[PDB]
Amino acid sequence: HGSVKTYMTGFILSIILTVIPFWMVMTGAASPAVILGTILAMAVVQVLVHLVCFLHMNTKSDEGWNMTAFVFTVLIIAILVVGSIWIMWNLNYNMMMH
Amino acid sequence: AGGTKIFGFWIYLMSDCILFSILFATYAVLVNGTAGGPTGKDIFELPFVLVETFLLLFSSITYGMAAIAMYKNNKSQVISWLALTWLFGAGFIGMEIYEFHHLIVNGMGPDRSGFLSAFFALVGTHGLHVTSGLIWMAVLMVQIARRGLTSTNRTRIMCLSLFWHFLDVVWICVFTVVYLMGAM
Amino acid sequence: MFGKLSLDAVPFHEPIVMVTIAGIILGGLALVGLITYFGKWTYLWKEWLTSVDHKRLGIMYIIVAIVMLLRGFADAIMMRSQQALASAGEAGFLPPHHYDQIFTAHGVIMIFFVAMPFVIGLMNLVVPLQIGARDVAFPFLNNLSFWFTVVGVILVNVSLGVGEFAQTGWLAYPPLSGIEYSPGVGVDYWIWSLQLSGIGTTLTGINFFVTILKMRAPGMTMFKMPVFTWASLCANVLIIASFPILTVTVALLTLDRYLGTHFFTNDMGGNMMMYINLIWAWGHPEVYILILPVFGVFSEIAATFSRKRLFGYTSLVWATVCITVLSFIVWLHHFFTMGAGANVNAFFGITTMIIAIPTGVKIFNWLFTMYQGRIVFHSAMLWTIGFIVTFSVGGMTGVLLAVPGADFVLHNSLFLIAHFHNVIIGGVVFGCFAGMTYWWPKAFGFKLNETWGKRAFWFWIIGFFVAFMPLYALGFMGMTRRLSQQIDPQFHTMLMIAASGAVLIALGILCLVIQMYVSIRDRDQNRDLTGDPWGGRTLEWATSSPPPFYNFAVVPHVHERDAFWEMKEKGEAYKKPDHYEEIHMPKNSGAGIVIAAFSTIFGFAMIWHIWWLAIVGFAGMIITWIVKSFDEDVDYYVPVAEIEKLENQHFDEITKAG
Amino acid sequence: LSGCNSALLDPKGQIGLEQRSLILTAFGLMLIVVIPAILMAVGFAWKYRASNKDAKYSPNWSHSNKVEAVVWTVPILIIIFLAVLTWKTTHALEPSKPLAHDEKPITIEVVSMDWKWFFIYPEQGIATVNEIAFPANTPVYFKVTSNSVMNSFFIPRLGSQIYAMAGMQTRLHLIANEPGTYDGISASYSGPGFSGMKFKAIATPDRAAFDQWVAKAKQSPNTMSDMAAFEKLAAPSEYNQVEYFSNVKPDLFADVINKFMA
């Protein structure tokens, strides 16, 4: 259970972390690497902001099993996505006419 | 039993997160399978996506307002905030349907290429989740109006809170990975 | 108005399939007529079909599993006969169009509707009792999950008489399973059966996970739970984390087949290698989901029938957790030969053979549980010992396949068939039979016949070895899986030995059927009066046999591992409580069966492209869901008088016994 | 069980010989621990049966640091050795890795069809169905693709299989240590004609015999000089007899692959 103040804080932070990436990509603010790093980092930070301010994620709810489940799910997603990308990159490279 | 249900719904949402992750991996694998058709840069209109993002974020904040009203035991404010959230989500869905219709009528639908298939799968799965959330929200609004803020309805409001905020989090991931990275 | 559905879908021309359809229809009519004659329709509907009691649902799961085991084994027998005939230089009786259906359906049935429902039903029956809970966290969800499983069973069986089943292998690799090369309805039967059953499987995973986390009796910390509960928890974690993968992968295949999308097609930017990657990312966690619960069963049985504490409890629990985590980082060993290169293959082979260490730790912990015990050779213990031997061999061959260099020449060979049948039968099937024998008195209140149980065990183990060791040899001789026609004659001797082994397994199944019949016939002489027939150690043996529909009149309080054994050692077992209190219980609901029926209609309509009927079915599912959401009376209180009466009868039994 | 004269336990190719050695090594390493497990199961069952009143009974003995340490460490050592061998051999037996050999490799292009194997000898300008020849003790470079669906090109007595995917090229290197006729199959089920997807790999005693085979193929009245002829050959068929084609279109393998990469 949050409050109005934390909800508005998350709202403003989400607005900033959403506007900046869109402006950076639209206007070509910096180099492609800088733009990519900025948008990815801000996306991760905004996800954290939503998890804290809006979902009230904490290490005590449900005897800590709420946080445990979230962290385990993030690890499983990392395994699945990174492994799939790595496997498919290697497979596609080995599928070429070389 | 409310806490048990809310925790169980959180676990279900973890499973839904893995579902979306598989869709994201498929999109990453197939993003360049454009098959001589449009790429992301040729169809992603960033101002449109920004308006959609703001609609979904406003809906998340309004649901937070509804939850706050629920903890203040104010039925009318709960219903009003839920209605505003429903309108914002409906606007997001309408914009998404308009985008998909525009792509389809111009021979740019999922059957055109692997990239378009993956884009439709990911974005439309998110949209289907939003539509389910909207049907759920409408049912819950009617139930709250019929019987007020019972313990049953409070647990349901919390479960739908989890669902709606999670949908906006998934959308953060979606716009970052799909639209911003394709447009760049 | 009927989509593609037409009279031509019925395979009139096929005599074997037509005879089977007639036989199944006659059996269904006989069952309906017997239920009518005894007038048990109301009893069935009110006590089993709408039941939200986990014990009833577990029994129903196992009933479904055994009935589908019959069909899966009939498929296996047909395949063995066809291969024996074809290796002799004859056409046999199954042409490829039917044989390929047969092996695809055999795989799908044995995995999703025999193995999965069996372990799920065992967990349903046992876990709430072991932790001292009165029910699962979400009883109505439990009923709905069972009925979604039934939806899958119905769809796969309907594929027999209407259209045909997929001819692609049990995982439906594209582009062979795609619309271009599989234009028929078979892949759609596969798709919708799996999707509808997977919904229920995911819900079951969530239900059991929350149940174990939240509904344990006071004082039972995580490291005081019975090992079977730990295994169930890990299996449900794997279900929750992996079955969404199957949902998405099958949905993408569905989009490819129905909407002409290009996820897995040969051209237009599709990539079928992605389908193989995803399907196996689900697939390996599936085998670990199957094996973990039976590891728990074997732990319980070995401790009980050794009259000894389980050895290395903490080591066992952490090995289970390790296997759980590692089951998600090995899936590429299923397509080592697709050409991912040495780095990827080596990494995944190494992870695969790493996850073998905790399994060996488990095997040796069981061995040392038997060490310096007093081993009673109950049929359940025979299953346990046979599992140790057989599963050791099977896991050894699996570890061999984990080496990519060896897999390059053993992939898709009958060596692979032998390996996964070795592990499946030696672990999952043996453990399912062991747990069924072990908990039959708890479920029904009387013991199974031991003579026919032991005969069934001996037939099963000897027949497995005779049936599948020749397949290891055949794999070394270069015979590949899914061959049916003009099989090379030098495989003929091994194929004949395999057929004879299959016949021995058929005799084992007959022995099981006879065992059930005889046990039911003589149930009055083999009653379980005290609820503790084996001298068990966990809380499920603290109740009556069968337990009262509410499990425990008073939620027990645990102080140590093996709570019931400690209660017996301290004299605290069978103590009449000073007073009783009303018990909150969930009411039975017909909503789950209605949602499942609408889902069945929806799946059938989608298979035959009956769009209006599919819309009706989907709308029915959602509308029934909403209407149920409007229900208020979903619980009731058991009066103290009822509890007093049941507890008094149980205590009269306890006093009479001793 | 196994078979002494089996394709994998009696291989005739270098890759297959190394794979046999790898299999035997892994088998022995695993036996080191598997045999004690089975023997202990049976021996503990017998010795500590409830009947035996002489055997020691320890109902409350449930933890032993020494026993747990041994049961954890022995598998760890076995698996460390197995993992080192796995890394080394996986990198040594990589299918795309060309072999170290004095003789120049012969390139054979492989196209799986429904349901038969089509082979192109780009250097010799011939093509065949369900039969390949090459000199023994001469490395063979296989370029593998599929025309319809997943197949697996496999000559069990020579060594590794490799998947054949449409629009994709996989590479396999094999060599025959002795001349002979070796059975070839598809190891990935590809449809109703799968059972008949057999071919013969003839390892000739010397290059003269391979040249005679090439010349015999060159006198074929039929040609594969156009994609239309390939499409005619690719119409579904089963249990295809051996056929030879002369004047194969150059870059035919590339054209087959490009059919799916538009």
Ligand SMILES: CCCCCCCCCCCCCCCCCC(=O)OC[C@H](COP(=O)([O-])OCC(O)COP(=O)([O-])OC[C@@H](COC(=O)CCCCCCCCCCCCCCCCC)OC(=O)CCCCCCCCCCCCCCCCC)OC(=O)CCCCCCCCCCCCCCCCC
């Ligand atoms: C506290 C709440 C808050 C926690 C959350 C906050 C922290 C967040 C961090 C995440 C949480 C971590 C887990 C903490 C559990 C908390 C609960 C708790 O501790 O109390 C319950 C419980 C208390 O229950 P109890 O009722 O009081 O009874 C306990 C008895 O006293 C016991 O009596 P016993 O006689 O039966 O003792 C049994 C003893 C076994 O009996 C022995 O003493 C013989 C020892 C055998 C040595 C051989 C080791 C085998 C492992 C090989 C590893 C090779 C090197 C790995 C290199 C990497 C691979 C390249 O222990 C074992 O079973 C060993 C199993 C180890 C296998 C793990 C897999 C190996 C990879 C991890 C390497 C580190 C392992 C450390 C080894 C510790 C040895 C004690 O605590 C215990 O379980 C006892 C201690 C054993 C803990 C095992 C630790 C597991 C290690 C996993 C780390 C993974 C690395 C990180 C990766 C994560 C992302 C992938």
Ligand code: HEO
């Ligand atoms: C529930 C069933 C189940 C179980 C439990 C296992 C367990 C294991 N499996 Fe199996 N498998 C199962 C069922 C399947 N497997 C497959 C495919 C498959 C493949 C792919 C091969 C290919 O496609 O060519 C590999 C490499 C393995 C390896 C392993 C390993 C290393 C284990 C390890 O978990 C086993 C560890 C256990 C051991 C080793 C025995 C006990 C240990 C001892 C005695 C002491 C310690 C010993 C050592 C350290 C060596 N499996 C397929 C696919 C079939 C299809 O394609 O249709 C199926 C269905």
Ligand SMILES: COC1=C(OC)C(=O)C(C/C=C(\C)CC/C=C(\C)CC/C=C(\C)CC/C=C(\C)CC/C=C(\C)CC/C=C(\C)CC/C=C(\C)CCC=C(C)C)=C(C)C1=O
């Ligand atoms: C390809 O088909 C093959 C298999 O699958 C691969 C097999 O299973 C088999 C082996 C079959 C065996 C004998 C296994 C027997 C094991 C049995 C008893 C367990 C089976 C479980 C069941 C009771 C089914 C449970 C699910 C059901 C209740 C769902 C109902 C599905 C039904 C019966 C199929 C629908 C059939 C239709 C109604 C046909 C349409 C009727 C027509 C209009 C006219 C019919 C005319 C005739 C002549 C009566 C063969 C023969 C085969 O070749």
Ligand SMILES: CCCCCCCCCCCCCCCCCC(=O)OC[C@H](COP(=O)(O)OCCN)OC(=O)CCCCCCCCCCCCCCCCC
């Ligand atoms: C590659 C990807 C492929 C897969 C695609 C997946 C697409 C589907 C994704 C969306 C899944 C939707 C998940 C819906 C979550 C709702 C779960 C739920 O019921 O919440 C539990 C909550 C607990 O409260 P309780 O008192 O116990 O009531 C239980 C129900 N009787 O109970 C309640 O609060 C009451 C809920 C009332 C029931 C509301 C149901 C609305 C959702 C219907 C879903 C179908 C929508 C169709 C979409 C349009 C299709 C064109």
Ligand SMILES: CCCCCCCCCCCCCCCC(=O)OC[C@H](COP(=O)(O)OC[C@@H](O)CO)OC(=O)CCCCCCCCCCCCCCC
């Ligand atoms: C679970 C997987 C999720 C993936 C979803 C994406 C796949 C669906 C793609 C559309 C099918 C292909 C086109 C066939 C149709 C086709 O080719 O016909 C072309 C047709 C245009 O012609 P009309 O039908 O308007 O013409 C008719 C007149 O001439 C006479 O009345 O396009 C459409 O109307 C479809 C636009 C629907 C767009 C909205 C649906 C988007 C998906 C759902 C998103 C979620 C939110 C929905 C909430 C309600």
Ligand SMILES: CCCCCCCCCCCCCCCC(=O)OC[C@H](COP(=O)(O)OC[C@@H](O)CO)OC(=O)CCCCCCCCCCCCCCC
């Ligand atoms: C796969 C398709 C399944 C059919 C779905 C449609 C269901 C139709 C029945 C619903 C209306 C019932 C109205 C109740 C009306 C009512 O109150 O009386 C129902 C009545 C219950 O009375 P009893 O049989 O208990 O006898 C009464 C005496 O005991 C005196 O009290 O039963 C019947 O006469 C038959 C009804 C069920 C017939 C079964 C349907 C066929 C099912 C086939 C499934 C295969 C077999 C497997 C079973 C495990």
Ligand SMILES: CCCCCCCCCCCCCCCC(=O)OC[C@H](COP(=O)(O)OC[C@@H](O)CO)OC(=O)CCCCCCCCCCCCCCC
């Ligand atoms: C995938 C699932 C497929 C079905 C599996 C096979 C089971 C079939 C049912 C067995 C026969 C039940 C006999 C009732 C026995 C009987 O007498 O009923 C018992 C019950 C109560 O009647 P009584 O007269 O005993 O009144 C007692 C009162 O005190 C109220 O509790 O009646 C009902 O409430 C209706 C139940 C029947 C209707 C349920 C089936 C309908 C749903 C399934 C079909 C789908 C419909 C949608 C399609 C568009």
Ligand SMILES: CCCCCCCCCCCCCCCC(=O)OC[C@H](COP(=O)(O)OC[C@@H](O)CO)OC(=O)CCCCCCCCCCCCCCC
């Ligand atoms: C070689 C491979 C290496 C494997 C290492 C894996 C390490 C595993 C560590 C898990 C983190 C434990 C932290 C819990 C911290 C927490 O909040 O729980 C606290 C909990 C304490 O519970 P109790 O208060 O009942 O007391 C139990 C004892 O600690 C008292 O002595 O800690 C445990 O004992 C848990 C033991 C691990 C059991 C793991 C269960 C499975 C984990 C996955 C759950 C999420 C599923 C989501 C579904 C998508």
Ligand SMILES: CCCCCCCCCCCCCCCC(=O)OC[C@H](COP(=O)(O)OC[C@@H](O)CO)OC(=O)CCCCCCCCCCCCCCC
């Ligand atoms: C166009 C053709 C339409 C035919 C539809 C067939 C409807 C038949 C309903 C049979 C229900 C059997 C009752 C068993 C009785 C039983 O035990 O189940 C009762 C169960 C839940 O009822 P309650 O919430 O009152 O709980 C009663 C007990 O379960 C107490 O726990 O089901 C319902 O009442 C849901 C009703 C669904 C109604 C579905 C509406 C039809 C959907 C199709 C519409 C399509 C429109 C398209 C628009 C795009």
Ligand code: HEM
């Ligand atoms: C009861 C004894 C059983 C026998 C005699 C048996 C026999 C076989 C046979 C003959 C095949 C085809 C092998 C080949 O391709 O040549 C096979 C495939 C298979 N079996 Fe079994 N089986 C049995 C039990 C089981 C069980 C319990 C499971 C799993 C739970 C299972 C799962 C499979 C799977 C997944 C396949 C692969 C199907 C595929 O081709 O797609 N079997 N079975």
Ligand SMILES: [Cu+2]
């Ligand atoms: Cu695996």
Ligand SMILES: [Zn+2]
């Ligand atoms: Zn490929």
